[PDB]
Design a protein around this ligand. Sequence first.
Ligand SMILES: Nc1c(F)c(=O)[nH]c(=O)n1[C@@H]1O[C@H](COP(=O)(O)O)[C@@H](O)[C@H]1O
Ligand SMILES: Nc1c(F)c(=O)[nH]c(=O)n1[C@@H]1O[C@H](COP(=O)(O)O)[C@@H](O)[C@H]1O
Lengths: 323, 331
Amino acid sequence: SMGFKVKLEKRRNAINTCLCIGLDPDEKDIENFMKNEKENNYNNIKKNLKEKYINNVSIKKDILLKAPDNIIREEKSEEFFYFFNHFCFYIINETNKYALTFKMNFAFYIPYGSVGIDVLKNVFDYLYELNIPTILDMKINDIGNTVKNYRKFIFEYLKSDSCTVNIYMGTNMLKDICYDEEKNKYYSAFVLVKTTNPDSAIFQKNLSLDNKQAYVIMAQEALNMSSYLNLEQNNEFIGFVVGANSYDEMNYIRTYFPNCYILSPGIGAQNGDLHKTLTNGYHKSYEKILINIGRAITKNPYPQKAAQMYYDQINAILKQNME
Amino acid sequence: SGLVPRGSMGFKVKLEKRRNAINTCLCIGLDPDEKDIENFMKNEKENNYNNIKKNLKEKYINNVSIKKDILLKAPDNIIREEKSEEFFYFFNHFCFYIINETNKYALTFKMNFAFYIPYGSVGIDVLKNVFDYLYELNIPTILDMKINDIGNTVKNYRKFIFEYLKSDSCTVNIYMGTNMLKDICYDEEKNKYYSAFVLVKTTNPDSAIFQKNLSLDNKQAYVIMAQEALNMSSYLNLEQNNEFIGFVVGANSYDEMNYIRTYFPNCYILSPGIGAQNGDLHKTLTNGYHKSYEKILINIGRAITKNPYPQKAAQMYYDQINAILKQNMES
Ligand SMILES: Nc1c(F)c(=O)[nH]c(=O)n1[C@@H]1O[C@H](COP(=O)(O)O)[C@@H](O)[C@H]1O
Ligand SMILES: Nc1c(F)c(=O)[nH]c(=O)n1[C@@H]1O[C@H](COP(=O)(O)O)[C@@H](O)[C@H]1O
């Protein structure tokens, strides 16, 4: 019942970081988990089985609760489901004490068909039980009638706190993403502003209007719609995705939108500079500058230590900025 | 087989061969909503499962991948013996019904992913059986998902769309950058090439705010984006491999349709917005006209799927399109 602004602030006060852990498991990660767990006699899956909230997931709980040794031989058709889900629970278990937010990119959960969407639901239920803020990164975009399906999937089925949105088609789509008039519900989102891909300048910087580059125009229009929807008063927000390799744009966005929520991917695997990113994007309410780190944690041999490393680096920078 | 392929190689070829046989550019959209599924279940109960019994006599239902056993059951037996499969069964049967009733008028079918996800996994199973079913019927397919991400991420969508569903094409939003197309329309590790349509001008009422108002070098953003897409298609050598990158241009965007067809004469256009939305068929098809009709796909979803007589609705659009194609050929 509390809005996302309030939930995020409360979590930030409890754990004192702005680390956002990205959970994007690829086929190799799942294969590697099954191989490593076969070698270490299922050390991590055995730990997963001891956690309280595994008893609360809603999809194929009985399969997940089985011993790894029983699955491989007598439930071959559930093997991929089992190891995929257990990899996700392992990462969450190892790293959640350091996380302000988890962000799950939908692309990683769909390419096997339905099975990965069951895993995704179980992941969102598990995070909900742990009371950890969630972002579903799906970069959704469509006309209003179609996009309402994503509002349902993301905010009703998964019970996500927030999602990502590409508003290139227009900003009117957000009326059917961030607001449900019949249910009188408000939801939060981050819109794409400046992205990490190497050619991101080709439309985001080269296109312009009124002496302002497209990324600035798009950030303004997203805030105009947030204001139209009265999201702030309802404890929700529309924020911006700004790449952690995009230092000038991060500085421009925080300078011209000093109150905005920013989500910043690109540190670690994509080699963004954490110091410049967090400094340029800084806000004393530092839930407003989420630093997403995916592969540098999930592909590290010791994800707890990887998360700790980034938690420590971030906190040192926040301390410097708090002066 | 290790021998040279004998079947169609490439979406361009698949589209042209079907267009030659059925003489239309109608694209039937299959976007079933919760009400559609509800209604089908209710109507079928009331007509003693007329349409599901028809579905069960079609041969290719025997070739779908997922829970075929369940789909082949008699509907009354589903209700009493497989109650937890009821929604899956009626959702998948509504789709087969629409496909059976309308496919003979369709150059291609476009399925919008959004309608298949909001129930969790169950709808993705339906989506896969739908693509399996259309594959068997050898009807060209489009998965409309407007995908976009960085390269490492988007490869997952390439896998889902082109390897798992075996779609012929998809829709893509290239606002993040054109280079994403290298990981969608091409697979370097397999030397495979796939087709896409990129968003150029969309039907939502505020579409001008970025697509028209933003500019570079005396060109509106939609022109910039179209050109970048075409440049990437050339770089990837798609057309030499019988694939293409085309454009989504809304059926209510007449000036832009004219511009696009004029300045990109041989491009593939996909145009939604007629029927349920405010598009005008005559104006759209006239501005986007190409003698290779398959380069101007006219998508109609709700005006067919929400019609109580879908075959006749499809026939009427097919007939109208053919009359307009005739006027534009010069009878
Ligand atoms: N949402 C994104 C953007 F808008 C963007 O400009 N760049 C991104 O990387 N992501 C996502 O952020 C994550 C980066 O993960 P990691 O590199 O493993 O740390 C992936 O989910 C990406 O798809
Ligand atoms: N892909 C689209 C565009 F880029 C666009 O500008 N406008 C659209 O309507 N669609 C899709 O086209 C279909 C319109 O369906 P119908 O109105 O029922 O005939 C839906 O799937 C829409 O999401």
